[PDB]
């Protein structure tokens, strides 16, 4: 909501920053296996639960 | 003073922009300045000498032609 606690507004901010694609130079790394960020979240498909 | 400030202010501000642009300019640093200086000298020596020789060599050949 608009009414927010500092603790919640800080938890939500960290969940916002983790929701990005991987850098493309990570692919060229020597022993790389990651193809994409498998931990992507969508506000509508799955809920943070808090 | 219209006719004074009507030309003084722009020229005065033109200095303001000029100084400001110089502060924002990335200026070459002594190590960067030295790197190019030795670079340009060598490159200058190459082209000029190569041309200097060619101009010399055709001198006798020019004499034969004329």
């Amino acid at each position: 909501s608009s009414h927010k606690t500092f603790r919640i507004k800080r938890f939500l901010a960290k969940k916002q920053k983790q929701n990005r694609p991987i850098p493309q130079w990570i692919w060229m790394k020597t022993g790389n296996k990651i193809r994409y960020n498998s931990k992507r979240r969508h506000w509508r498909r799955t809920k943070l639960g808090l | 003073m219209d006719q004074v400030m009507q030309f003084v202010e722009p020229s005065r501000q033109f200095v303001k922009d000029s100084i400001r642009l110089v502060k924002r300019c990335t200026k070459p640093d002594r190590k960067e300045f030295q790197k190019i200086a030795m670079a340009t000298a060598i490159g200058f020596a190459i082209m000029g000498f190569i041309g200097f020789f060619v101009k010399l060599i055709h001198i006798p050949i020019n004499n034969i032609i004329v």
Partner: protein
């Protein structure tokens, strides 16, 4: 539009073109293409034209770019290049925005350069800069056209080959830089000698020193003669050129680096450079024109209307026959105020005039630089459109707010960039440095590109 492309279309359909290199060429191979390219051009310069008979001078045809196969230099091919982006910038020509049409558009540029060459070669034959046709005959005149003409096509064709990845950079810039370089080196080590009544005197300024530092018994005398000649080059002139070289080098690095990034991909941060010399050597060239032909008009005008104060005040003229061609001298009035001082003693003996000319030269250079950007399509709006077309943007800005950010520096870089260009030239000429700023700026900038290219490939070369 229709009667512009359709006219050009058929002609380029037949015109020649060089093929691409399918896979990237190795650097040491590129050098070898470049090395052969520069050698060929130099030969063409040293070759005097065949058939120049009456007037321009056999000695001149032996010694000197005057009278060579490169009499026109690269001005014809250059003239089309400026003419082209002038018309495109001027909106006189509708831009055929497709890669193959754009190649064809470049084809029209090549055609114009060839057109100019024949136009210039024909004109110079008419004017008699090699003699009268009624004396030489047309067959000799025709040979003159062919030699100049074919040279332009070869020179035109050679530069592209280097541009197309077979060599390094641009041949025209290489040649122009080298000529500047050979000019200073020539004046520095020429073994040629000139018979002063005291004997033969070496043109090579450095040669003359030791030649005069060994011959003359009093080394105090040679401490002046070699360094303060007036009919011969001096090592002081070489000294300033060295100092000017350092100055130009320092100001080559000045630029405003704006952060831009691709709108499509994260990271990938790149910088758009706004060079201080935003308008290159164009402003002085334009400045030269107004100076040169203002004297021509003011000279002619006073002759027919010497009695008018509207003309006498504008300028009083004199024909100074100082050996070479009669040198026009503004006796007084505006034109004299719009003329340079010739000697250090004159400068200090007339400080007020020195201030006026110095100030005017700067003001002219700045103005021509500022106005040139709007004409040449290099203003903020044009640059923004280039970036928008290339999918580049400033981080945190909208497409429309890029124009505002560029306007902070582009108009100021133009005025301050042009002002510095003129100022540097004035100091260089006040110091009599060989070639002034225009040559030095070009040579310094050009060697940097090849320097930069070498550094990249130096990674393993």
């Amino acid at each position: 539009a229709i009667k512009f492309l359709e006219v050009i279309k058929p002609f380029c359909v037949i015109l020649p073109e060089i093929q691409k290199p399918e896979r990237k060429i190795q650097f040491k191979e590129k050098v070898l293409w470049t090395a052969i390219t520069l050698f060929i051009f130099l030969v063409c310069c040293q070759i005097p034209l065949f058939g120049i008979m009456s007037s321009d001078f056999y000695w001149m045809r032996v010694i000197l770019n005057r009278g060579t196969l490169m009499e026109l230099g690269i001005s014809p091919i250059v003239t089309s290049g400026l003419i082209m982006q002038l018309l495109a910038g001027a909106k006189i020509i509708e831009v055929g925005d497709t890669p193959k049409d754009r190649a064809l558009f470049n084809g029209a540029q090549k055609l114009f350069g060839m057109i100019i060459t024949i136009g210039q070669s024909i004109v110079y034959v008419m004017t008699g800069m090699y003699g009268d046709p009624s004396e030489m005959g047309a067959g000799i005149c025709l040979l003159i056209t062919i030699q100049l003409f074919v040279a332009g096509l070869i020179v035109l064709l050679l530069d592209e080959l280097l541009q197309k990845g077979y060599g390094l950079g641009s041949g025209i810039s290489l040649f122009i830089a080298t000529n500047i370089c050979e000019t200073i080196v020539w004046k520095a080590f020429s073994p040629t000698t000139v018979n002063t009544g005291r004997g033969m005197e070496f043109e090579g300024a450095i040669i003359a020193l030791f030649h005069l530092l060994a011959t003359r018994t009093d080394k105090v005398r040679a401490l002046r003669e070699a360094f303060y000649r007036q009919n011969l080059p001096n090592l002081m002139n070489l000294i300033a050129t060295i100092f000017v070289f350092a100055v130009v080098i320092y100001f080559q690095g000045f630029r405003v680096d704006l952060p831009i990034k691709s709108a499509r991909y994260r990271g990938q941060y790149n910088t758009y450079p706004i060079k201080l010399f935003y308008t290159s050597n164009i402003p002085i060239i334009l400045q030269s024109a107004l100076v040169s032909n203002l004297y021509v008009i003011s000279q002619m005008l006073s002759a027919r209307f010497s009695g008018n104060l509207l003309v006498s005040l504008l300028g009083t003229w004199s024909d100074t026959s100082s050996g070479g061609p009669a040198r026009a001298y503004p006796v007084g009035g505006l034109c004299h105020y719009l003329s340079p001082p010739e000697s250090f003693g004159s400068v200090l003996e007339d400080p007020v005039h020195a201030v006026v000319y110095i100030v005017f030269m700067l003001g002219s250079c700045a103005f021509f630089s500022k106005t040139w950007i709007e004409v040449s399509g290099s203003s903020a709006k044009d640059v923004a459109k280039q970036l928008k077309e290339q999918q580049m943007v400033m981080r945190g800005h909208r497409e429309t707010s890029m124009v505002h950010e560029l306007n902070r520096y582009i108009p100021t870089a133009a005025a301050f960039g042009g002002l510095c260009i003129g100022a540097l030239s004035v100091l260089a000429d006040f110091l009599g440095a060989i070639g002034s700023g225009t040559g030095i700026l070009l040579a310094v900038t050009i060697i940097y590109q090849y320097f930069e290219i070498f550094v990249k490939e130096q990674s393993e070369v």
